[PDB]
């Protein structure tokens, strides 16, 4: 499995569907066939919603994933230990399905600033696109883009910005890094 650096903000914003949860129960099910008619399975993890902070208003109670991480199946430490930050995509109907490219991170591991921009900031900043610079000298096009200097400034993917900046649309379409007021 391999996967692009994501800022967290920008993972909140393209996931359908983001919670804090425990893993209560697993259990390998048959969730349909392919294109080709061959059974599609996976791993349904039964949780614990704690808290919704975007999807669909209907709790989730199970969280669905591949078999294994060599395509990307995600592992959850089960047995109502682990809290886990879950941002994923929402099948309806109480489910949603997550895989590695995915933001899942122990609950626990989150910045303060990350944990509260969970409930309305990071939401201020779903129109913006946050941008990676690969590397000095870097640019952007759009006015509601921030350009994401973590990389390039610290060599860390979880740098500054990751942990305490979000990115947020202003008056003109155009869009900012701010560190969150107060």
Known sequence: ??????????????????IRAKAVSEKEVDSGNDIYGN???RIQYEI???????GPEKDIEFIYTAPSSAVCGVSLDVGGKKEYL???KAEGDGKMHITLCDFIVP???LSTTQKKSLNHRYQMGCECKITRCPMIPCYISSPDECLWMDWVTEKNINGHQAKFFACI???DGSC???RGAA
């Open 1 to 18: 499995c391999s996967c692009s650096p994501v800022h967290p903000q920008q993972a909140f914003c393209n996931a359908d569907v983001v």
């Open 169 to 171: 649309k202003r008056s």
């Open 107 to 109: 609950w626990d591991t």
């Open 39 to 41: 059974p599609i399975k």
């Open 176 to 178: 900012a890094w701010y």
């Open 48 to 54: 614990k919603q704690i808290k919704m902070f975007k």
């Open 86 to 88: 879950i941002a994923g």
